[PDB]
Design a protein around this motif. Structure first.
Motif, PDB file in Angstrom:
ATOM      1  N   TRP C 166       0.992  -1.168  -0.053  1.00 14.49           N
ATOM      2  CA  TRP C 166      -0.047  -0.099   0.169  1.00 14.49           C
ATOM      3  C   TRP C 166       0.735   1.299  -0.017  1.00 14.49           C
ATOM      4  CZ3 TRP C 166      -5.503   0.479  -0.231  1.00 14.49           C
ATOM      5  CH2 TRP C 166      -6.056   1.622  -0.052  1.00 14.49           C
ATOM      6  N   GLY C 167       1.130   1.728  -1.178  1.00 14.70           N
ATOM      7  CA  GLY C 167       1.770   3.152  -1.344  1.00 14.70           C
ATOM      8  C   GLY C 167       3.282   2.533  -0.881  1.00 14.70           C
ATOM      9  N   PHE C 168       4.042   3.737  -0.004  1.00 19.92           N
ATOM     10  CA  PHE C 168       5.426   3.320   0.110  1.00 19.92           C
ATOM     11  C   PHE C 168       5.581   2.755   1.488  1.00 19.92           C
ATOM     12  CE2 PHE C 168       6.936   7.393  -2.600  1.00 19.92           C
ATOM     13  CZ  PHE C 168       6.838   6.598  -3.781  1.00 19.92           C
ATOM     14  N   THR C 169       4.713   2.305   2.052  1.00 14.65           N
ATOM     15  CA  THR C 169       4.736   1.376   3.412  1.00 14.65           C
ATOM     16  C   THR C 169       5.317   0.016   3.069  1.00 14.65           C
ATOM     17  OG1 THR C 169       2.526   0.548   2.849  1.00 14.65           O
ATOM     18  CG2 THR C 169       2.659   2.618   3.832  1.00 14.65           C
ATOM     19  N   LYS C 170       5.097  -0.839   4.090  1.00 14.89           N
ATOM     20  CA  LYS C 170       5.570  -2.088   4.110  1.00 14.89           C
ATOM     21  C   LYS C 170       4.495  -3.156   4.191  1.00 14.89           C
ATOM     22  CE  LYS C 170       8.393  -1.457   7.736  1.00 14.89           C
ATOM     23  NZ  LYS C 170       9.346  -1.638   8.606  1.00 14.89           N
ATOM     24  N   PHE C 171       3.301  -2.996   4.238  1.00 14.35           N
ATOM     25  CA  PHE C 171       2.269  -3.927   4.665  1.00 14.35           C
ATOM     26  C   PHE C 171       1.519  -3.972   3.427  1.00 14.35           C
ATOM     27  CE2 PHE C 171       3.305  -1.835   8.888  1.00 14.35           C
ATOM     28  CZ  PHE C 171       3.498  -2.914   9.388  1.00 14.35           C
ATOM     29  N   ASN C 172       0.896  -5.150   2.920  1.00 15.12           N
ATOM     30  CA  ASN C 172       0.463  -5.315   1.852  1.00 15.12           C
ATOM     31  C   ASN C 172      -1.183  -4.689   1.722  1.00 15.12           C
ATOM     32  OD1 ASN C 172       2.212  -7.015   0.834  1.00 15.12           O
ATOM     33  ND2 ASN C 172       1.356  -8.589   1.998  1.00 15.12           N
ATOM     34  N   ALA C 173      -1.458  -4.116   0.310  1.00 10.30           N
ATOM     35  CA  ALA C 173      -2.538  -3.468   0.073  1.00 10.30           C
ATOM     36  C   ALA C 173      -3.911  -4.162   0.006  1.00 10.30           C
ATOM     37  CB  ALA C 173      -2.409  -2.655  -1.145  1.00 10.30           C
ATOM     38  N   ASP C 174      -3.769  -5.459   0.156  1.00  7.41           N
ATOM     39  CA  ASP C 174      -4.945  -6.472   0.139  1.00  7.41           C
ATOM     40  C   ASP C 174      -5.773  -6.126   1.653  1.00  7.41           C
ATOM     41  OD1 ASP C 174      -3.183  -7.506   1.628  1.00  7.41           O
ATOM     42  OD2 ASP C 174      -3.494  -9.555   0.561  1.00  7.41           O
ATOM     43  N   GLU C 175      -5.156  -6.250   2.632  1.00  2.06           N
ATOM     44  CA  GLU C 175      -5.482  -6.191   3.931  1.00  2.06           C
ATOM     45  C   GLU C 175      -5.166  -4.760   4.744  1.00  2.06           C
ATOM     46  OE1 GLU C 175      -3.677  -7.070   7.202  1.00  2.06           O
ATOM     47  OE2 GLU C 175      -1.791  -6.561   6.129  1.00  2.06           O
ATOM     48  N   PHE C 176      -4.682  -3.635   3.899  1.00  2.32           N
ATOM     49  CA  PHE C 176      -4.330  -2.730   4.642  1.00  2.32           C
ATOM     50  C   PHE C 176      -5.498  -2.054   5.296  1.00  2.32           C
ATOM     51  CE2 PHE C 176      -3.546   2.037   4.505  1.00  2.32           C
ATOM     52  CZ  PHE C 176      -2.255   2.094   5.386  1.00  2.32           C
ATOM     53  N   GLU C 177      -6.579  -1.582   4.330  1.00  2.00           N
ATOM     54  CA  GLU C 177      -7.803  -1.187   4.994  1.00  2.00           C
ATOM     55  C   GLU C 177      -8.535  -1.961   5.882  1.00  2.00           C
ATOM     56  OE1 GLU C 177      -8.917   1.884   4.297  1.00  2.00           O
ATOM     57  OE2 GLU C 177      -7.414   2.559   2.863  1.00  2.00           O
ATOM     58  N   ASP C 178      -8.115  -2.917   5.795  1.00  2.00           N
ATOM     59  CA  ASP C 178      -8.719  -4.163   6.640  1.00  2.00           C
ATOM     60  C   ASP C 178      -8.072  -3.937   8.184  1.00  2.00           C
ATOM     61  OD1 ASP C 178     -10.495  -6.794   7.000  1.00  2.00           O
ATOM     62  OD2 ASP C 178      -8.738  -7.327   8.025  1.00  2.00           O
ATOM     63  N   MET C 179      -7.047  -3.490   8.292  1.00  2.00           N
ATOM     64  CA  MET C 179      -6.238  -3.574   9.569  1.00  2.00           C
ATOM     65  C   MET C 179      -5.725  -2.332   9.832  1.00  2.00           C
ATOM     66  SD  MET C 179      -2.604  -3.913  10.740  1.00  2.00           S
ATOM     67  CE  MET C 179      -1.781  -4.598   9.021  1.00  2.00           C
ATOM     68  N   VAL C 180      -5.901  -1.239   9.114  1.00  2.00           N
ATOM     69  CA  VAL C 180      -5.493   0.182   9.784  1.00  2.00           C
ATOM     70  C   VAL C 180      -6.748   0.489  10.307  1.00  2.00           C
ATOM     71  CG1 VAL C 180      -6.634   1.464   7.463  1.00  2.00           C
ATOM     72  CG2 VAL C 180      -4.702   2.490   8.994  1.00  2.00           C
ATOM     73  N   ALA C 181      -8.026  -0.024   9.974  1.00  2.00           N
ATOM     74  CA  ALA C 181      -9.448   0.159  10.559  1.00  2.00           C
ATOM     75  C   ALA C 181      -9.543  -0.015  11.886  1.00  2.00           C
ATOM     76  CB  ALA C 181     -10.384  -0.619   9.712  1.00  2.00           C
ATOM     77  N   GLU C 182      -9.275  -1.122  12.630  1.00  2.00           N
ATOM     78  CA  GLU C 182      -9.477  -1.373  13.994  1.00  2.00           C
ATOM     79  C   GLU C 182      -8.513  -0.567  14.844  1.00  2.00           C
ATOM     80  OE1 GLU C 182      -7.961  -3.838  15.930  1.00  2.00           O
ATOM     81  OE2 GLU C 182      -6.720  -4.704  14.557  1.00  2.00           O
TER      82      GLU C 182
END
Ligand SMILES: [Mg+2]
Ligand SMILES: [Mg+2]
Ligand SMILES: [Mg+2]
Ligand SMILES: [Mg+2]
Ligand SMILES: [Mg+2]
Ligand SMILES: [Mg+2]
Ligand SMILES: [Mg+2]
Ligand SMILES: [Mg+2]
Ligand SMILES: [Mg+2]
Ligand SMILES: [Zn+2]
Lengths: 105, 157, 208
Positions: C166-182
């Motif tokens: 997801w962008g210039f981060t190190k976390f995968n974009a499939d579950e980024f919105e799933d896991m920045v959420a909580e």
RNA sequence: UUACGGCGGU
RNA sequence: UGCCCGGUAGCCCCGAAGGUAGAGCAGGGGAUUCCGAAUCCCCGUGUCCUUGGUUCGAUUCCGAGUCCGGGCACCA
RNA sequence: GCCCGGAUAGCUCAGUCGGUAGAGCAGGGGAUUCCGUAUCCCCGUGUCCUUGGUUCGAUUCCGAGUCCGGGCACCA
RNA sequence: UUGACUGGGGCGGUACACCUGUCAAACGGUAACGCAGGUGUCCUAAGGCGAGCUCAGGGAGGACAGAAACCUCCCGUGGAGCAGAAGGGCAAAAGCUCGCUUGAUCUUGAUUUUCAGUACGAAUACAGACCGUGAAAGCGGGGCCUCACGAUCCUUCUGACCUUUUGGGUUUUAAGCAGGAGGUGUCAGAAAAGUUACCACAGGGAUAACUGGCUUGUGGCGGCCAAGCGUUCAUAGCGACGUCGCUUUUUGAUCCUUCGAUGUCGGCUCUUCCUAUCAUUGUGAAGCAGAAUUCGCCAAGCGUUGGAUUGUUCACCCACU
RNA sequence: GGCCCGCGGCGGGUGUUGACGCGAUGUGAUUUCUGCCCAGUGCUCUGAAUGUCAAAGUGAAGAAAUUCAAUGAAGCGCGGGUAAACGGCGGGAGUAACUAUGACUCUCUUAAGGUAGCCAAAUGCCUCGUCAUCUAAUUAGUGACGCGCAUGAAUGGAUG
RNA sequence: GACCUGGGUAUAGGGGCGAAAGACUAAUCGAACCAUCUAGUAGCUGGUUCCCUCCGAAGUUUCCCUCAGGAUAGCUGGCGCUCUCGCCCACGCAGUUUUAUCCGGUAAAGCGAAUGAUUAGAGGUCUUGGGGCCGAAACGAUCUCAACCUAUUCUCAAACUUUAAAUGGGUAAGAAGCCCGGCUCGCUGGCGUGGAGCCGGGGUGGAAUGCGAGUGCCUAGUGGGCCACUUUUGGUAAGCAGAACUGGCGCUGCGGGAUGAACCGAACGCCGGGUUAAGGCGCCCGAUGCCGACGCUCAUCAGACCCCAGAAAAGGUGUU
RNA sequence: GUCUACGGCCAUACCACCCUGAACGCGCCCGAUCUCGUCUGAUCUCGGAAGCUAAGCAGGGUCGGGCCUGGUUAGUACUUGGAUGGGAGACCGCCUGGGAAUACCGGGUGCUGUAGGCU
């Protein structure tokens, strides 16, 4: 280098530590009639010119200063020699430095 | 060329390792070195007075001489085409006991006594050690399940 | 300035600007991020890297011409302030010049042959990213063409890779919105601050 | 014994 | 290698041997002249290259220890 | 086509003690005198070459780029 | 007589004796005129011991007092200091302050480092005296460690109630024995200015000045990408910032061949070859109306001159073409 | 006596000579000029003004060898002279009513700072200097110019 | 005419004579010729005479007015000698592994760990540096850049490092070892303590593999080296300069690489038969003259076998 | 179940904050006439014993920070030896044997020696 006027060191003539007079040593008068002067004066005589090497390619600028330690207690009066690692400027009795100066150059 | 100085290539090896600086542990000095004790040399960096050289650090010798604060050790040094029994005075902080013969000293102690157990019991224990033999014909068991089929993963960057 | 054929393949052990060098000019790149740097994490979801195929040296001056070539292209279709270009590898290897005839044999021969500093290059490994841009997901075909025009200014071989993050981060974009959420990720500007479950419980009370 | 100068026009 | 001399105001130089630091220059002011120029005067300007020493205080007077500049000798 | 010091008002130039940008020529305005010459004074005019670093502090120090002049010059 | 090393020699430099970091490829060893530096000292304390104390820094306060004075409290693993070049080491310390002192003395060997496993130098562990300090254990025979220096011959001084001074005595003198110093920086240590185009000899392709060979920085000639130039319009013609090659007609780098010799600039004369094509033949494209030009293609068949200056190659000018 | 020869002699040469001579140098006819520097290097000259300075001789100490002191020839040092002796003849600051320059003023180094002349010269690197002239065309030639890398006065300068 | 010449005469070798060129001095002159000292010296060239057998190098260390040379150590040969195996255990040793046990700071990795570099945003506020206003004025009141800090993030280091390999280095793997008894000491010292030494007694089969060792003397040649893996320094690079490890060439033929010092096999007494290695098998040229297998490729510059002797970026609705 | 005196190993023992501490002890404490030392009985030295666990100290706590230990990372990065392997090179893959480091995740948090006292 500053080394004082008096010094308690070992003298071999009695085998104790007891004080001394310490003064700078000078080389003394190069005497005639020594064996290598009696030899040199007859070899250099005649014709032939300068016969032994005169050294000129000087490189060192200091000398190992040596001190003569004269034993002060009477009826001993026994001298010796002692060397110091070499130095340019040699004072004998010059006013022991205190560590609270205001140096002011 | 290369500045033949004492303590020359020891930017790292005459140093205390990391977070073991400061003053030394005192059981370093309460070691007992007799003649013929096999000792090895690891020169520290805090005591300057008797560190050997950079040629004996990591080597192992044997004590022939014991004095107040140091120990004479006879080591072998590889010079060009011959090795030399050399004897060095090293202070006591720079050495330790070599544990290289201490796993031999058990199997001369518990080997001499187990020899005389076969004289009272009557057997042929074969106290000499052997290398790791080839493996025995054992028997594996896949009880219940069946083996796992694995296969190489595809390439993704 | 000699051609880049001379200053290519990584031969010398790395010789950086330090107190031992003291004579090195400046690199022609001085700015490294050139899009809208101020953006948040969710404003540009995808990214696209260009990745080296071989182990070589890219000069500081070639990295200038590449990022100008990409910043010029992406204001044309993606528009000004609709992207975030980042040039990732920094020039720290100082190359040298044996500046002879300073038409004569008169200076030296090969006698005093250790040269003077002449430029800075970046040692790049196989699989190391050079440039990286991030955009909207609607502007995905402009990512490749911006990096396609930039690779003609580099020696060697590069491949362009659309990433899985997801962008210039190190976390995968499939579950980024799933896991920045909580709770587990908090956004701080253009990056993501991962929070574990092992700190003091007081900051967990400061959260929620 | 030494005493050199004195803007232009009115 | 020992003998023989000389060391200063901001720069040259007076002496000086037991009793003060002085000609010129430069700086700053006056005075002179109708006015400049020249000229005259006054200030300010000094651990005398630096460490001691009797007499009577002391750069000197004294030769010593020191550094700058110069002397005629020569065996590792 | 390599090196040594310099980049500053309209010019030119010194100093930019790690703490102001100040002599001077050109123009402006006065004052001066019967009127002018000269004069004398005041006002104008500084990215102190560009960027980066070193302290309530850098044009000034340190070194990068650009420029300007000034230069190391063998036998064959 | 006129040092050596030396990407020929010279000039320069010291890589000629020594030290630190690196090179160096995790024992040690390891080169270059490789990198970054240092050395020919300094110290009666900056040596020796003992005691007490804590550093750089930062914060918060306190008349002037402000970034910088001194005072106080707090935090402070060395971020300071230890003479100096670096590295290692060091906290009731090896630093800072104070109190006594001279072990920086006398003497024999052993050992380590350089190494041939020689020497000097430096160092280590002792042993025997005599000392200092401390309540004492202890520590100390120079500098916290790694550098800081020097043979024989000669000179000089010191040492013992010493030996020899030649037929025997006495005395000066002289010679010895032991160890300090007066040096050899080309630092295992000779006593040393050029020039030679009037030169000579023994040599050397171990060694320069040509060609050749490798290399291609530099020169030359091209390709790719395309922000801009071109009224508009990237690409008719160009083309910045890049970046990839080719060529050996330039210059260098190199020192393989040649030193019992390969005749060394230019011009003249004459031959042949290459194409990276000036003209001519056939073409394609233009920001090609004609004319004149430009950019490409197959293309080396055939041509590519006359002179003034200069030894010139080169350069420049006149004239024809 | 000067300059020379000579292993040697009061031996020879100039010399069967004598300052209009002999010996030693430099420059180079004629005409015309020959500037400034004696610090340096030489050369030379002088006074028990005077520092340093050998033997022999003098004095002292000593059993003597020896040691020490005093005294002091030439020379050098000091002072004068000398450049048709070897040579040298640079900078830096102020200063004219446009700027530029400096007749003038003052300094350093080290004594003096290139005068009269001459020049891109057989002497000028840059350089094929610039301008004029000669040629259709000139790195040539000649004539001018002149802070002339590095011209110059018996190292002779300029002429003819 | 400072003219040209004959004969006589004088000058002789570091001397002569010179209108000066180092000219001439008997074809010789920047020091004649002749004989001798003299077979002068040469770290420098060139040469160095019969056969067979056996062994077999080095171009490196240290010092030297040393760098075209020597002395020194190494490598070499010759001579031996001391012994060991000859017919339920080898004295011993090893360019090896194993078993343990130490040692180390390179590759890598790290910097949200120290030192040194370095990019970006976020959050917070003591503030000053500077702005925006309510305003005579009030650290009365309200924002922005910065700076500072905090938590992150991009990129590095021959002379940075917590961590840290592979290869490597040392030691040990028994009789010289183990245990017990006693006694000497002037060392040590609460102590029949401690430690050394000496005497006496008791029990030998103590990882794998290979192998005969130990020892002395005399000693020549050498002291220019060169290449290739891999590791690395200077350099744009080099058939360039300089190191590390190992193997080669030099000293070495033979088979293959057309050709060749060093590549790949393999090392050599004189032959016969067999088989192979590297490499090959259209024809030169021994061997596919196999009814070999499966595809890819058309070039108006095809391609064709380690070192090794020719090519890149870019491009093709050429085919797969 | 702890403490004191002296120690060993030197963070699983530290650092910050917070709770508890019976009894003996250790401390805070109370004083300068002598011993001693200061600008200053603060320190150090010396005489005490009215208080107090407030602090130090000792136990415990913190989805604590460090530290220690193990997973992942990862048979990855590197590497021994090998090939007439690939590629114009740069580099790469295979064979043969070895074999890490951080992020991330979890579990721990002093152990004991001699002498003496409380309980
Ligand atoms: Mg092979
Ligand atoms: Mg009191
Ligand atoms: Mg008292
Ligand atoms: Mg009290
Ligand atoms: Mg309490
Ligand atoms: Mg409590
Ligand atoms: Mg706890
Ligand atoms: Mg925790
Ligand atoms: Mg390998
Ligand atoms: Zn005595």
């Amino acid at each position: 280098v500053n080394v004082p006027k008096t010094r308690r060191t070992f003298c071999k003539k009695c085998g104790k530590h007891q004080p001394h007079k310490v003064t700078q040593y000078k080389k003394g008068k190069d005497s005639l009639y020594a064996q290598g002067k009696r030899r040199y004066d007859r070899k250099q005589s005649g014709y032939g010119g300068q016969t032994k090497p005169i050294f000129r390619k000087k490189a060192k600028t200091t000398k190992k200063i040596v001190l003569r330690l004269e034993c002060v207690e009477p009826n001993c009066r026994s001298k010796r020699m002692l060397a110091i690692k070499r130095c340019k400027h040699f004072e004998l009795g010059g006013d022991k430095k205190r560590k609270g100066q205001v140096i002011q150059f | 060329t290369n500045t033949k100085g004492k303590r020359r290539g020891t930017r790292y090896m005459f140093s205390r390792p990391f977070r073991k600086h400061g003053v030394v542990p005192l059981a370093t000095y309460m070691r007992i070195y007799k003649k013929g004790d096999i000792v090895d040399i690891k020169g520290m960096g805090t005591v300057q007075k008797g560190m050997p050289h950079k040629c004996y650090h990591g080597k192992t010798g044997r004590v022939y001489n014991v004095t107040q604060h140091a120990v004479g050790i006879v080591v072998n040094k590889q010079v060009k085409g011959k090795i030399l029994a050399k004897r060095i005075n090293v202070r006591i902080e720079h050495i330790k006991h070599s544990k290289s013969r201490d796993s031999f000293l058990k199997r001369v102690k518990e080997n001499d006594q187990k020899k005389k157990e076969a004289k009272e019991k009557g057997t042929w224990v074969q106290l000499k050690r052997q290398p790791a033999p080839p493996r025995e014909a054992h028997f594996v068991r896949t009880n219940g399940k069946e083996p796992e089929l694995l296969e190489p993963i595809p390439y993704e960057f | 300035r000699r051609p880049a054929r001379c200053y290519r393949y990584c031969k010398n052990k790395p010789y950086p600007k330090s107190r031992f060098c003291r004579g090195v000019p400046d690199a022609k790149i001085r700015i490294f991020d050139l899009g809208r740097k101020k953006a948040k994490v969710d404003e540009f979801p995808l990214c696209g890297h260009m990745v080296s195929d071989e182990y070589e040296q890219l000069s500081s001056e070639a990295l200038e011409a590449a990022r100008i070539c990409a910043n010029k292209y992406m204001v044309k279709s993606c528009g000004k302030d609709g992207f975030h270009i980042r040039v990732r590898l920094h020039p720290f290897h100082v190359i040298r010049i044996n500046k002879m005839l300073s038409a004569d044999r008169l200076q030296t021969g090969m006698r005093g042959a250790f040269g003077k500093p002449q430029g800075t290059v970046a040692r790049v490994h196989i699989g190391q990213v050079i440039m990286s841009i991030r955009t909207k997901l609607q502007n995905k075909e402009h990512v490749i063409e911006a990096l396609r025009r930039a690779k003609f200014k580099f020696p060697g071989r590069q491949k362009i890779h659309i990433s899985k993050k997801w962008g210039f981060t190190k976390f995968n974009a499939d579950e980024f919105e799933d896991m920045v959420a909580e709770k587990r990720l908090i956004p701080d500007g253009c990056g993501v601050k991962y929070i574990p479950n092992r700190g003091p419980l007081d900051k967990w009370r400061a959260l929620h």
